[PDB]
Amino acid sequence: MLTEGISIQSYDGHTFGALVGSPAKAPAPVIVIAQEIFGVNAFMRETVSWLVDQGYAAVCPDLYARQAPGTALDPQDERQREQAYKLWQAFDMEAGVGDLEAAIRYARHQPYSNGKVGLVGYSLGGALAFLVAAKGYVDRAVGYYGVGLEKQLNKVPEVKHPALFHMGGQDHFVPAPSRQLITEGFGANPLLQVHWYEEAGHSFARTSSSGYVASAAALANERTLDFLAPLQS
Numbered sequence: 001m002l003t004e005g006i007s008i009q010s011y012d013g014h015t016f017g018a019l020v021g022s023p024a025k026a027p028a029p030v031i032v033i034a035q036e037i038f039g040v041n042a043f044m045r046e047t048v049s050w051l052v053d054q055g056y057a058a059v060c061p062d063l064y065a066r067q068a069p070g071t072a073l074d075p076q077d078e079r080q081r082e083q084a085y086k087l088w089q090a091f092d093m094e095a096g097v098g099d100l101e102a103a104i105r106y107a108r109h110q111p112y113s114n115g116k117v118g119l120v121g122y123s124l125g126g127a128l129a130f131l132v133a134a135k136g137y138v139d140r141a142v143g144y145y146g147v148g149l150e151k152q153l154n155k156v157p158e159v160k161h162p163a164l165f166h167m168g169g170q171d172h173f174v175p176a177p178s179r180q181l182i183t184e185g186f187g188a189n190p191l192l193q194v195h196w197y198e199e200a201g202h203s204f205a206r207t208s209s210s211g212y213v214a215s216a217a218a219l220a221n222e223r224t225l226d227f228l229a230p231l232q233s
Contacts, residue, residue, distance in 0.1 A: 001019055001040060001045060001072060002017040002018060002019050002040055002062055002070065003017070003018065003020045004017075006018050006020055008099075008102050008103055010095075010098050010099050010101075010102040011101070012098065014065075014066060014095075014099070015065075016061055016062045016063070016065035016066075016069065016099060017061075017070070018059050018061040018062060018106075019044060019045060020057075020058070020060075021048040021049065021051065021052040021057060022052075022057055022112055023052060023055070023056060023057040023112050024053075025055075026057075026111070026112035026113075026114075027112060027113060028055060028056055028057050028113070028232070028233070029057070029113075029114050029115075029117065029118060029139075029228070029231035029232055029233075030056065030057040030059060030107035030108070030113050030117050030118075031056045031058045031059070031117070031118045031119065031228065032058075032059050032060075032061065032100060032103045032107050032117065032118075032119045033048065033058055033060040033119075033125065034060075034061075034063070034096075034119060034121030034124070034125025034126070034129055034132075035060060035061075035063055035121075035122070035125050036075075036122045036123040036124055036125060036203070036206070037084045037088040037123055037124045038071075038072070038075050038080070038081075038084045039062070039063075039070075039071035039072045039073050039084070039087075040060050040062055040072055041072040041074065041075075042074075042208070043206045043207075043208065044060045045060075047060070047120070047122075048060055054225055055232055056118075056228070056231075057107075057110065057112050057113065059103055059106065059107050061102075061103040063091075063096050063099055063124075063125075064087050065099075066092065066095055066099075067091070071083075071087065075206070075209065076208055088124055091124065093127070093128065096124075096128050097128060097131045097135065100128055100132050101132070101135070101137050104137045104138055114231075114232075114233050117138050117231075118138055118139060118140045118142070119132055119137075119138045119140075119141040119142065120141075120142040120143075120144075120224060120228075121142070121143050121144070121146070122143075122144040122145065122203075122205065123144070123145055123146065123202065123203060125143070125146075126143035126144050126145050126146030126165070127143070127146030127147055127149065127152075128143075128146070129142060129143030129146065129163065129165075130143055130146055130152055130155070130163065131152070133159050133163035134152075134155040134158040136158075136159075136160050138161065139161055139162075139231055140163070140164075140227060140230075140231060141162075141163040142163070142164045142165070142166075142224050142227065143163070143165045143166070144165075144166045144204075144205055145166065145167055145168055145171055145173075145203065145204070146165070147174075148173075149165070149167075149174075149178075149182050150174070150178040150181045150185075153182065153185035156185050156186065156189050156192065157188070159189055159191050159192055160191065162191050162192075162193075162227070163191065163192055163193070164193045164224065164227045165186075165192070165193065165194040165195070166197065166205070166216075166220035166223070166224070167179070167182070167194060167195070167196050167197070168197050168201040168202055168204050168211075168213075168216070169196050169197055169198040169199070169200065170199065170201040171200075171201045172201065173202060179196065182194060193227075195223065197213070197216035197220060199215070199216060200213040200216035200217075201213075204217055204220075205217040205220055205221065
């Protein structure tokens with residue numbers, strides 16, 4: 001689902017929609033939410049809802065719109081998971097960073113905006129949050145279980161604004177040697193924080209996942225809220 005009528009334009013001219021939640025009280029900082037591999041679906045709407053209840057406005061852009069606008073897949077339907085994996089394999093990461101940059105600019109200028117913008121991404125959106133943190137587009141970025149982070153560590157010194165990452169210790173995408181490289185690499189830049197949740201794997205913060213772990217979701221989420229709180233007026 002997207003908010004009808006909302007259109008954001010990327011630097012290259014491509015336009016796409018977004019699910020937007022205005023804040024309970026304005027002005028308010030705006031959080032851009034970077035989707036998992038399933039499009040803008042129930043978990044995105046639940047996240048927009050959660051962040052508005054916590055005092056933010058939120059914008060979740062349709063990142064798969066360069067491939068197929070309006071994709072919203074059910075993570076529990078096997079056929080749709082197959083379609084999600086196909087979309088992810090074809091996804092242009094650099095264009096996704098550019099689309100997020102455009103959603104971040106949009107977020108800075110809504111009537112309800114206090115001028116500060118944060119970014120929270122999950123899975124695919126978690127990998128994109130690191131790349132956005134290296135570009136410096138937002139005041140603070142958060143990523144939950146992005147894949148392939150160990151391949152992007154040369155960008156660590158590029159990060160110049162705070163970024164927080166939540167990683168599942170039992171995530172099969174991150175074997176022990178990868179977790180060690182990430183830990184060592186992040187340690188060289190104090191603006192980066194990465195926390196490991198030992199009893200959780202991928203997607204641990206989504207209730208519909210067979211990998212949901214309530215205790216790790218709750219700890220990670222409270223750390224996310226404490227980390228974004230300084231953006232509030």
